[PDB]
């Protein structure tokens, strides 16, 4: 029955990934962020400039105060509410319905977007990082718990607006092809995973592979770059660098604070090399890679001029809190969060962007001797 979730998922270029819930008795519809990053459902529930529709508890039969205050704090933007329960459902997700803790935001720093057509946030994330703490139940494990859904979501995000589909409860084998290669859970907390090599248009970065998870390696649908710990990144930007000397990028560039751009369909894709992440897999000594496009790492934006020049965002930055895979990793797969039995899948996606000559890839098995000696203690 996942057909009725397949494209549920829209947004603008560059502004997130949304699905449409509905909170409340009676209904009362908004449009909500997906984010394996964190484990809060918060949605707006007071006037803001950028929000045109808010949750209005007074005018919901079912919500419960919890009487509590709560905070989240992101790497980008933050905000405060009121915690309490009500009643809620995905229109295009299963025929269910949940009573789900929700955070009301009644005040917020540089989190809502403006012209985003998001009002909150679905963190899918688990417990353990959950705000205040981590008794505070996560919307889909309310939903594992009270219904009969079974306990896995898949994403996959169509990038430039922007759309996708989240199938609660299972996997759609008609959104991707090829084989899904899983890679261990480390933790349920974020979705943490161990990254076990590097390599730059096949060419291996050599580093002493804890330096790619340090202190941790998350998937992150909420973040859009390919955020890399700083010794990480210093390397990727010096080959990738190499690479395009062809041509001359600002420095700006590099740091993501500049654009660069090419007269409309000259864009030198062939001069950026393409990325590999190998991921520990399921069996000793076993993982398997998945390969990015420059397509994906460079985000088209808005020519600032009157032209109708191709202008891009380098969107790998620098990070201190260890990797985060975002939708520039996501939006090339099938990415299978199966939280059943503790592993992530990556296929690859059938609305992956198109290179001329070169394909987006996932592809096993490989060897790699002690995998476990690259995850960071
Ligand atoms: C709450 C706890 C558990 C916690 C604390 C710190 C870090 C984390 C890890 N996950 C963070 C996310 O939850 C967290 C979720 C976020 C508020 C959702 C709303 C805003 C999305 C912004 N956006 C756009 C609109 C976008 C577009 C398409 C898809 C996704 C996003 C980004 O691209 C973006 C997001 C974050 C950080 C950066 C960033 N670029 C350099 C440094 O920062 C960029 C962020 O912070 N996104 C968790």
């Known amino acids: 029955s996942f057909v009725e979730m397949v494209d549920n998922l829209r947004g603008k270029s560059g502004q997130g990934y949304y699905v449409e819930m509905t909170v409340g008795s009676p209904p009362q519809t908004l ?7 964190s484990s809060n459902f918060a949605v707006g529930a007071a006037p803001h400039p950028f929000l045109h529709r808010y949750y209005q508890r007074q005018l919901s039969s079912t919500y419960r105060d919890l009487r509590k205050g709560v905070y989240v704090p992101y790497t980008q933007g ?43 946030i679905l963190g899918l994330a688990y417990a353990e990082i959950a705000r205040p703490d981590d008794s505070l ?18 994403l996959q995000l169509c990038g430039a607006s922007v759309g996708g589909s989240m199938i609660i409860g299972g996997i759609d084998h008609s959104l991707y092809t090829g ?11 974020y979705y943490e995973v161990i990254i076990v090599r590097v390599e730059i248009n096949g060419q291996d970065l050599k580093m002493d592979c804890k330096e790619y998870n340090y ?51 000259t864009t030198p894709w062939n001069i950026f090399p393409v990325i590999s992440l ?14 990015i496009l420059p397509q994906q790492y460079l985000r088209p934006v808005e020519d600032v001029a009157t032209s109708q020049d191709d202008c891009y965002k380098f969107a790998i930055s620098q990070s201190s809190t260890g990797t985060v895979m975002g939708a520039v990793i996501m939006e090339g797969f ?33 060897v790699t001797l002690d995998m476990e000696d690259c995850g960071y203690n």
């Open 31 to 37: 449009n909500i962020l997906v984010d394996t990053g």
């Open 78 to 120: 933050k905000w405060e509410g009121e915690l309490g329960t009500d009643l809620v459902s995905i229109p295009h997700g299963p025929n269910v319905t949940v009573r789900a803790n929700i955070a009301a935001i009644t005040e917020s720093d540089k989190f809502f977007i403006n012209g985003s057509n998001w009002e909150g």
């Open 137 to 154: 139940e996560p919307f889909f494990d309310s939903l594992v718990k009270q219904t009969h859904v079974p306990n896995l979501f898949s």
């Open 179 to 189: 084989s899904l290669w899983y890679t261990p859970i480390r933790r349920e907390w």
């Open 215 to 265: 202190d941790k390696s998350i998937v992150d649908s909420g973040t859009t770059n390919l955020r890399l710990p700083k010794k990480v990144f210093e390397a990727a930007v010096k080959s990738i660098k190499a690479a395009s000397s062809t041509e001359k990028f600002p420095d700006g560039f590099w740091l993501g604070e500049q654009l660069v751009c090419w007269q409309a369909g």
């Open 278 to 291: 190998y991921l520990m897999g399921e069996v000793t000594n076993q993982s398997f890679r998945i390969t």
């Open 334 to 366: 099938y990415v299978v969060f199966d939280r059943a039995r503790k592993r992530i899948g990556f296929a690859v996606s059938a609305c992956h962007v198109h290179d001329e000559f070169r394909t987006a890839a996932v592809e096993g098995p490989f």
